[PDB]
RNA sequence: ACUCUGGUUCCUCUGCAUUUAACCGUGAAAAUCUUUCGCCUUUUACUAAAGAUUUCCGUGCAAAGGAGCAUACAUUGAGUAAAUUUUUGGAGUCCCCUCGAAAGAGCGGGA
């Protein structure tokens, strides 16, 4: 998946939950990475067991400390176009009959 | 890409890695000491400069203290955990 | 399509009673397939028979020398 | 320059803004990132250090070695660059 | 068979000539020589 | 080719028989610039 | 290289190496001559004719009106498109006669 | 003033812009739009309401589009043509999601599976029914019949493929057996269209013999499967593949007609309820709006007629 | 009433840019990362035509003619006609070092 | 992994080429109307300027269809291939005090 360059983006912009080697859990929208597995998380938060929450912001995690990451949530979200004809109202002309 | 994955195997004829070289081709069990303070005893069937190995027919033992052990049919070991590899005197050539 | 009730004029002929739009019949625009239209002309011209052009043709499936059409 | 991954480029655009970074020993430094490097060595001006016990000091400058940074909090606007 | 066999031939010929590539929509706008 | 009717029309230097575009080399353009010289202005800029 | 450096300051079209073709009628071979000042010795006959040609040019350019973005009425294509006209190739003096 | 039956802008609407014989037309199951195509190869989309503006026009076929159906969730349009190809058009993207390039002759009809995994049954002048699964390039099933097949549908459970053609007999192919489990015999001439009732109990099948026969396709039937025969319409020398369709309440049936009239029959009595004039050539395809009493009819005259009917 | 008295260039729309506009607006809060720069010199020493390059780099749809200077910042029609910059025009852009 | 297409040259149709400083035209015609100058026993044909519209010889691009020539599957839009201090070849493990049934946590301390 990730870093297979034809599918580099395989989890980009997903909401992902990141576990660090100190046992912290960060959560955020994973939207960049590096060859050193550095990652940049937008709208990031941290979570701990009791569940305790804190807001961080745009977090850059140095890759050295990442244990693992998982998909937490979908990316945010929002017959084509053309045309030639017209569709004025009308009525049925009566034809001939036998 | 793969050129430096194939050229690698020259130095292992003579370097300290020879205990792995003999462990493979003559099929000696080796008692690979690892981090986690655990011992793996098994026949290496491949290895590399980084000291990865694939182990057949493994006995894992440690103290938990009371002795506990686990049997693993096949394993890949990441070489960064390898402290110390020993040709086990409790085994032989096979 | 409910038929007109009552008798019919003795004086007017069937030609004169007929539904019409011009002096001689009911002209109306049409859209045939150009290929099949040409096929039917040439069958009538060359063979003497063609498939019937009428809408609601009923039993009269062939026109012209119908004996050849069936044979 | 030669290409380098987006996280490092964004770090160079975090220069001149306030940042917060936590070191592997646990201390949290908030300051203004006056310089960054491709190895993510950081110079913080105007720094406030927060120890894990919650005490704090001001520090006029700090250099933190790149491989001793656990994570940073960049500013928000860099998501538009 | 043979009655359906003849009808199978007829349908092949009629459809092919009708939907011929040489008669699809836009063609027969001949160039003056 | 200098005195053909539509010179170069069939060659690579012009788009084709419709004769709508041309793309010359500097040996061509400089030989032509010489041959035109009796008709051309000596002025190098509009300031005159 | 010395020739290329010369072409850069050449009169148009020679500062171009590429472009669209023009109609033979469009190319006014002498127009550069009367745009610039009349040579010092030319008779009054000639000096006046320079001014008069200049006047035509100034009147043309003053009353330009740029061309309408409108449909191209191809008269002769509409003629070529009917059974009544055929095409061939002729010597110009034959077609002229 | 007069009675009204729908949100149509007028009791009859005439939709204009096609450039050739309109062979096929279908409503979106959600009722928002309808799609129409034919010899002009473009596929025109029309809103059912308001100005009925031609809001989109898909292009891509290199041949006449012989048949055209929406998938049941309305997210995709299946279409097939004389370019030997079935195509699935994504509605939100307007783009060819899949192109089942595997038929060897003209594809006459297409029908998507009603539910479950999306499968596309198709029938062709190569004599084969094929069922294409979106997930594979290769077809799931190829059912070689000996003679050209002109019409196809699944059953409602999407596990039998029903087809008809030059041999006049309808085949019913059972997709777990890969055999014809039974045939429906009774048409005197080649079949031009087959359509499956909303409940799936019945099919109609139109034929060049100028009859529509209703067949009972339920697994058990205690006797003869021929339910009834409708008549009134006519097939002319153009030999168009005149389609047929079901009212969404099943009380009414339609078929295309060469006599210019849009025919509606009542399913129970077999009486003609509507024989609407107004086309000027073969009414090739007819369909009902899925939620509201509106009739679609598509002519060889390049005209589409939308209009209200009293579905009493 | 339709007195087309235009005397300066005016853009109906915002042009596209390489940077997002929101990044420009947000950089305004940080005076460490901005510079206020005059460009000066003699007449016709290339000032405006230099700004044309920065415009072309930051605005993908910005058109430079192959044979005339765009002079984006000469917005007055008299500056267009006189061919010289007459009044100073500011241009704020985001640019990478 | 999906659908997307053979190059060239030519013909013809359709659409667009108004935010003009300026330019579809690095060239340059004719007409009509309104007005003002000069011819003049009248009108036409005119003089030479303004303003407003037209016609005519031409121009560009996009898109579609066809017609000739010789012939090639890649490639577009969507998306592939480094064990020596700063990341991806281990400074890792183990043991006491505290709160608490429960398991962690202190810049806690020790090997
Ligand atoms: N050779 C050459 N000429 C240039 C270059 N840049 C600009 N010019 C020309 O120099 C003239 C002046 O360019 P401008 O951009 O108008 O210079 P400017 O200084 O802004 O003019 P003012 O602002 O009015 O003083 C024009 O004729 C340009 O074509 C250049 O890089 N090389
Ligand atoms: Mg300037
Ligand atoms: Mg008189």
């Amino acid at each position: 998946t990730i870093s297979k360059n034809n599918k580099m983006m395989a989890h980009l912009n997903y909401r992902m939950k990141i576990i660090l080697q100190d046992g912290r859990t960060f959560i955020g929208f994973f939207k960049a990475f590096d060859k050193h597995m550095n990652i940049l998380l937008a709208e990031c938060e941290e979570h701990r067991q009791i569940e305790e929450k804190r807001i961080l912001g745009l977090v850059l995690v140095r890759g050295e400390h990442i244990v693992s990451m998982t998909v937490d949530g979908p990316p945010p979200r929002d017959g084509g176009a053309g045309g030639v004809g017209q569709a004025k109202p009308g009525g049925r002309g009566m034809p001939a009959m036998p | 890409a793969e050129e430096l994955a194939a050229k690698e195997d020259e130095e292992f004829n003579v370097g300290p890695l020879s205990i792995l070289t003999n462990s493979v081709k003559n099929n000696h069990q080796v008692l690979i000491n690892c981090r986690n303070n655990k011992k793996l005893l098994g026949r290496v069937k491949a290895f590399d400069r980084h000291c990865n190995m694939v182990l057949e027919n493994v006995k894992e033992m440690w103290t938990e203290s009371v002795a506990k052990d686990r049997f693993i049919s096949k394993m890949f070991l990441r070489g960064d955990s390898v402290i110390l590899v020993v040709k086990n005197p409790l085994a032989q050539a096979e | 399509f409910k038929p007109e009730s009552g008798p019919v004029n003795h004086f007017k002929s069937e030609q004169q009673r007929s539904q019409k739009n011009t002096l001689t019949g009911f002209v109306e625009p049409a859209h045939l397939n150009e290929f099949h239209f040409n096929r039917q002309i040439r069958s009538f011209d060359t063979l003497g028979y063609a498939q019937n052009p009428t809408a609601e043709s009923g039993t009269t499936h062939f026109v012209g020398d119908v004996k050849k059409a069936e044979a | 320059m030669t290409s380098v991954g987006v996280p490092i480029k964004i770090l160079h655009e975090a220069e001149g803004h306030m940042v917060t970074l936590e070191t592997v020993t646990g201390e949290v430094y908030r300051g203004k990132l006056s310089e960054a490097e491709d190895n993510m060595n950081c110079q913080l001006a105007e720094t406030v250090v927060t120890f894990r016990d919650g005490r704090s000091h001001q520090l006029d400058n700090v250099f933190i070695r790149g491989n001793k940074i656990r994570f940073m909090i960049l500013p928000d606007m860099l998501k538009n660059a | 068979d043979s009655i359906l066999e003849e009808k199978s031939r007829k349908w092949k010929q009629l459809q092919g000539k009708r939907y011929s590539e040489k008669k699809k929509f836009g063609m027969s706008d001949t160039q003056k020589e | 080719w200098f005195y053909d009717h539509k010179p170069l029309a069939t060659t690579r230097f012009v788009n084709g028989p419709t004769y709508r575009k041309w793309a010359f080399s500097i040996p061509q353009m400089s030989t032509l610039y010489r041959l035109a010289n009796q008709l051309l202005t000596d002025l190098v800029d509009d300031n005159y | 290289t010395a020739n290329g450096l010369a072409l850069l300051w050449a009169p148009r079209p020679f500062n171009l190496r590429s472009g669209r073709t023009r109609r033979a009628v469009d190319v006014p071979l002498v127009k550069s001559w009367y745009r610039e000042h009349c040579p010092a010795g030319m008779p009054v006959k000639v000096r006046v004719s320079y001014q008069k040609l200049l006047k035509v040019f100034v009147l043309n350019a003053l009353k330009h009106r740029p061309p309408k973005p409108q449909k191209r009425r191809y008269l002769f294509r509409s003629f070529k498109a009917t059974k009544f006209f055929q095409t061939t190739t002729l010597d110009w003096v034959e077609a002229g006669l | 003033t007069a009675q009204r039956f729908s949100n149509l802008m007028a009791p009859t609407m005439v939709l204009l812009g096609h450039e050739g014989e309109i062979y096929t037309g279908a409503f979106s199951p959600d009722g928002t739009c309808l799609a129409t195509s034919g010899y002009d190869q473009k596929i025109f989309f029309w809103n059912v309401y308001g100005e009925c503006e031609n809001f989109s026009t898909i292009k891509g076929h290199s041949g006449a589009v012989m048949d055209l159906k929406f998938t049941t969730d309305s997210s995709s349009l299946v279409s097939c043509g004389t370019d030997k190809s079935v195509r699935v058009w994504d509605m939100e993207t307007g783009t060819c999601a899949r192109r089942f390039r595997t038929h060897t002759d003209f594809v006459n009809a297409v029908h998507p599976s009603r539910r479950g995994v999306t499968l596309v049954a198709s029938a062709s002048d190569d004599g084969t029914c094929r069922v294409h699964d979106m997930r594979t390039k290769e077809p799931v099933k190829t059912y070689t019949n000996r003679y050209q097949q002109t019409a196809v549908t699944f059953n409602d459970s999407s596990d039998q493929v029903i087809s008809g053609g030059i041999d006049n007999v309808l085949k019913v192919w059972d997709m777990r057996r890969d055999e014809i489990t039974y045939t429906l015999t009774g048409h005197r001439d080649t079949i031009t269209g087959i359509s499956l009732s909303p409940s799936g109990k019945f099919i109609i099948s139109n034929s060049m013999d100028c009859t529509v026969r209703q067949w009972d396709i339920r697994p058990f039937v205690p006797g003869q499967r021929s339910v009834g025969v409708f008549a009134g319409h006519n097939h002319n020398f153009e030999k168009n593949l005149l389609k047929c369709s079901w009212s969404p309440c099943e009380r009414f049936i339609t078929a295309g007609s060469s006599d210019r009239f849009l025919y509606v029959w009542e399913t129970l009595s077999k009486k003609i309820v509507y024989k609407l004039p107004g086309h000027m050539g073969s009414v090739n395809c007819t369909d009902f709006h899925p939620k509201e009493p509106i009739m679609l009819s598509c002519g060889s005259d390049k005209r589409v007629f939308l209009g209200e009917i009293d579905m009493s | 009433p339709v007195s087309k008295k235009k005397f300066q260039a005016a853009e109906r729309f915002l042009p596209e840019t390489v940077y997002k506009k929101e990044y420009l607006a947000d950089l305004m809060d940080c005076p460490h990362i901005m510079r206020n720069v005059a460009i000066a010199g003699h007449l016709h020493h290339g000032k405006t035509t230099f700004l044309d390059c920065l415009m072309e780099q930051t605005h993908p749809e910005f058109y430079r003619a192959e044979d005339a200077d765009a002079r984006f910042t000469d917005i007055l029609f008299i500056e267009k006609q006189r061919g010289c910059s007459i009044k100073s025009q500011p241009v704020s852009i985001v640019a990478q070092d």
Side-chain angles (χ1 to χ4, degrees), chain H residues 73-272:
Chain H
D73 62 24
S74 196
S75 67
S76 299
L77 183 83
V78 189
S79 66
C80 67
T82 68
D83 59 337
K84 310 186 181 184
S85 297
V86 182
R87 301 185 193 218
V88 187
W89 301 99
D90 182 275
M91 289 298 295
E92 279 68 33
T93 320
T95 202
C96 181
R98 296 293 265 91
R99 179 175 170 184
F100 306 123
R101 61 180 69 84
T102 94
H103 272 288
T104 70
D105 210 340
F106 299 167
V107 183
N108 292 314
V110 83
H111 187 251
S113 59
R114 275 185 166 186
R115 70 188 73 86
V117 291
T118 293
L119 305 178
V120 180
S122 61
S124 172
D125 287 349
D126 61 23
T128 72
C129 271
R130 281 181 160 105
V131 179
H132 297 288
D133 176 349
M134 298 291 284
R135 300 171 294 178
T136 57
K137 292 182 181 181
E138 193 72 359
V140 185
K141 301 300 188 176
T142 298
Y143 295 129
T144 52
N145 195 19
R146 182 173 167 182
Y147 299 121
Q148 294 103 308
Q149 298 296 285
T150 56
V152 72
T153 183
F154 289 111
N155 66 342
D156 176 83
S157 49
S158 305
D159 69 328
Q160 298 173 358
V161 186
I162 305 182
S163 79
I166 286 183
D167 40 354
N168 330 301
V169 175
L170 299 83
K171 306 299 193 172
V172 180
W173 293 89
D174 185 358
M175 292 176 58
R176 67 187 56 77
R177 307 186 202 208
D178 298 323
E179 296 190 343
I180 298 151
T181 45
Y182 59 89
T183 59
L184 303 162
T185 58
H187 283 295
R188 268 61 175 165
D189 207 358
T190 85
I191 291 176
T192 61
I194 299 164
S195 184
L196 175 74
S197 53
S199 66
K201 300 187 187 197
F202 305 111
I203 65 178
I204 52 181
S205 57
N206 195 14
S207 167
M208 300 188 184
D209 78 359
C210 307
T211 69
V212 178
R213 298 182 196 264
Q214 179 188 351
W215 309 96
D216 191 349
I217 68 150
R218 288 179 287 185
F220 173 85
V221 175
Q224 195 178 30
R225 289 183 177 272
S226 181
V227 187
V229 186
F230 309 87
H233 67 303
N234 199 56
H235 294 58
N236 69 2
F237 61 88
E238 305 176 279
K239 298 186 180 288
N240 291 2
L241 298 182
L242 307 186
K243 311 302 180 184
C244 56
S245 188
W246 284 94
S247 171
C249 69
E250 285 182 33
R251 298 201 303 285
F252 309 108
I253 281 158
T254 54
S257 185
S258 294
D259 69 356
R260 311 176 176 216
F261 296 106
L262 161 59
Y263 284 86
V264 178
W265 300 261
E266 176 177 44
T267 306
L268 182 61
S269 71
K270 307 173 289 181
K271 294 181 179 179
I272 299 159

Side-chain angles (χ1 to χ4, degrees), chain I residues 47-48 74 85:
Chain I
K47 297 174 298 298
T48 301
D74 288 17
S85 313

Side-chain angles (χ1 to χ4, degrees), chain A:
Chain A
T1 56
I2 278 290
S3 305
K4 302 301 186 166
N5 208 68
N6 193 283
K7 300 290 171 270
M8 179 202 297
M9 67 289 289
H11 302 305
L12 286 182
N13 312 294
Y14 282 77
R15 188 175 168 92
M16 297 199 79
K17 180 174 185 176
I18 282 63
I19 302 97
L20 303 185
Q21 284 192 341
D22 65 0
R24 285 179 167 129
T25 298
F26 291 167
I27 311 191
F29 292 94
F30 164 54
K31 77 185 305 181
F33 72 96
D34 188 19
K35 74 178 183 184
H36 315 93
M37 322 99 143
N38 299 311
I39 54 93
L40 190 74
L41 301 180
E43 297 162 44
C44 179
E45 296 167 304
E46 70 150 309
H47 284 253
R48 306 186 194 169
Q49 300 295 150
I50 300 184
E51 193 165 44
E52 183 175 323
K53 197 184 76 158
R54 166 182 171 234
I55 304 164
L56 303 185
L58 174 56
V59 173
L60 163 59
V61 177
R62 177 178 176 91
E64 198 166 350
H65 308 292
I66 299 167
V67 176
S68 187
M69 65 185 73
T70 185
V71 178
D72 183 47
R77 299 183 177 137
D78 297 359
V84 180
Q86 292 191 353
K88 65 187 179 183
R92 298 172 177 281
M94 193 71 187
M97 284 89 71

